[model samples]
Target chain A: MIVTTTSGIQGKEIIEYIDIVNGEAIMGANIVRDLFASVRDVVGGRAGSYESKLKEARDIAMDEMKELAKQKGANAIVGVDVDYEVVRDGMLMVAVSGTAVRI
Target chain B: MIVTTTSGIQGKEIIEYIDIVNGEAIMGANIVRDLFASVRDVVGGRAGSYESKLKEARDIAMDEMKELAKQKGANAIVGVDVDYEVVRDGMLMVAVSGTAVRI
Candidate 1:
């Protein structure tokens, strides 16, 4: 299935326009607490493990959205947007959105 | 309570650093389906209603984090981050995160 940020595919014509689709996850702050206690890298205090967690969370949300798009009988998603947030101190949140349509 | 994005307040010293805290909400994709049939604006297709929904969701998450920080005995939250995501075809998620501490 095609996932793109643009409005439409270059040469393909869009079929029926399905509603907007999305996926998201709450990345638990368990490690965030660990950061305060561990904070390995010193100066910059690189939040390496936590960064990986965010990437993992994003992947989960993307896969979830793609699955929904497929379930809705669509082969493509367009105008996608993703955003990140930190909440409840240590928890991380990742969300993705796009419009699903047939091509 | 003060919520700032910087690592520390210019004039104050942090007392004890509480763990990172966060809050989030899964803004249901309920109305996302409504957009297809009822896109009120023409070319631009204004998503006025959806924007309001996002704002509301952000507010909820922020409030939740602040309350948690307060309960954790913090008078302020620093290095705050907020993000938004679209998932599951129509759901919107808002997340807020920050370090909680006494000043």
Candidate 2:
């Protein structure tokens, strides 16, 4: 499945519009613990590992969104919006939404 | 310049690491207005325009991050992380960060 943030893929033609699909993942139970505030102070220094954690959460959210589109028989997703935020002391939420389409 | 959330491009060899860079964009002064609560009520129905507003904020944040990498003579960015959140009643923030590298 093709997934992008843009409204449409450059070369692909969207032949049909399916439905709006969304997915979410909440993470950082172990890594975050109770140090959410301190995480920012060292974010730049330990960005390698920090970023990987983000990617891990994002993958779960995006993958579920992709699976939903696939279940609907859609080949691509368009106008995708991604939102990442710290919902609580040690929890981060990655949520994404998009319009599913067949190209 | 190439910018992606992945750690590295598949075919590209990273020759040098520039630095960690980030950018932010805040939006939704007029559209969101005081309708922040109400907006959520109709977000699914008006996702077309709502999503576009998000794209606008994301583009600004991504562009500035890309510009920072360019200034440091990096040809690409890797391990990008995107964050979006509502800061106030009518404000939203889109922040992105990544490692700048020469490819």
Candidate 3:
């Protein structure tokens, strides 16, 4: 089913919490491939090993957000925001959160 | 000293507010040049007008966030998160926010 709109929700409906959906939902083998597919117009940056890790973290964050939406009984999440942090050279942390409600 | 971490500050101290610093802070012309200089070897399409606007919005958002950080008496913003929405086919709205604190 397509995730659509619903009422009784406001900006405050955005409930921030540390929830993660543990799973590997890889977009593809090469992060560069996916990255290019994402924004072909975006110039620069060959996808190196570091890029791979960042992509994985982003995917994880999105996965978790999707899971959170599911838990909230929402079919989809609009205005989803995903953020990433590079703690070290390669290691990264990704977080995703958004408003969840019935749709 | 850089915007290093300081104590007596917890994540809870993060104050959420909607603030924008208006003014032009466009990076040197040739965003593509700057972008390429920023990240080389990124295989993708050539920069177009749309890409330029996106870059402008991003830069503006960052500038505004920096202003917010200054207003908060914070040396820097950590764990920043940016979200973008394409309200129209060509236009976009970008929001940048993060945990602001004194360090």
Chain A TM-score across all models, in listed order: 0.80, 0.81, 0.48
Q: Each candidate's lDDT (Cα)?
A: 0.64, 0.65, 0.39
For model 2 chain B, where is the 10-residue window of minimal lDDT?
Answer: B37-46
Which digits, one per residue and each the tens of the lDDT, describe model 3 over residues A1-103?
Answer: 1111111122234344323233233333344223322332322112222234444555565566667668756653433345433333322345555555443
Runs with alpha carbons beyond 4 Å of true place in candidate 3 = A1-103, B1-46
Candidate scoring better on lDDT of 2 and 3: 2
Q: After superposition, how far is residue B53 of candidate 2 from its true place, in Å?
A: 1.9
Ten contiguous residues with the weakest lDDT in model 1 chain B = B39-48
What TM-score should be assigned to candidate 3? Answer: 0.32
lDDT of 2 by residue, A41-84 (tens): 54563554555656665776787778888999999877677876
Q: DockQ for each candidate?
A: 0.03, 0.04, 0.04
For model 1, the stretches where C-alpha displacement exceeds 4 angstroms are A35-47, B1-103
lDDT by residue (tens digit), candidate 3, B1-103:
1122221234433233222111112222243344434644554535433466566656665665566568756564544555553211221234454444434
DockQ class, candidate 1: incorrect
Clashes (backbone N, CA, C under 3 Å), per candidate, total 25, 0, 4
Once superposed on the true structure, which residue ranges of model 2 sit more than 4 Å away at CA? A2-94, A97-103, B28-30, B34-46
Candidate ordering by lDDT (highest first): 2, 1, 3
Q: For candidate 1, write residues B1-103 as lDDT tens digits.
A: 7665345543477989998999998766555444322322111112223434554676688899999999999988766666565555556577778899998
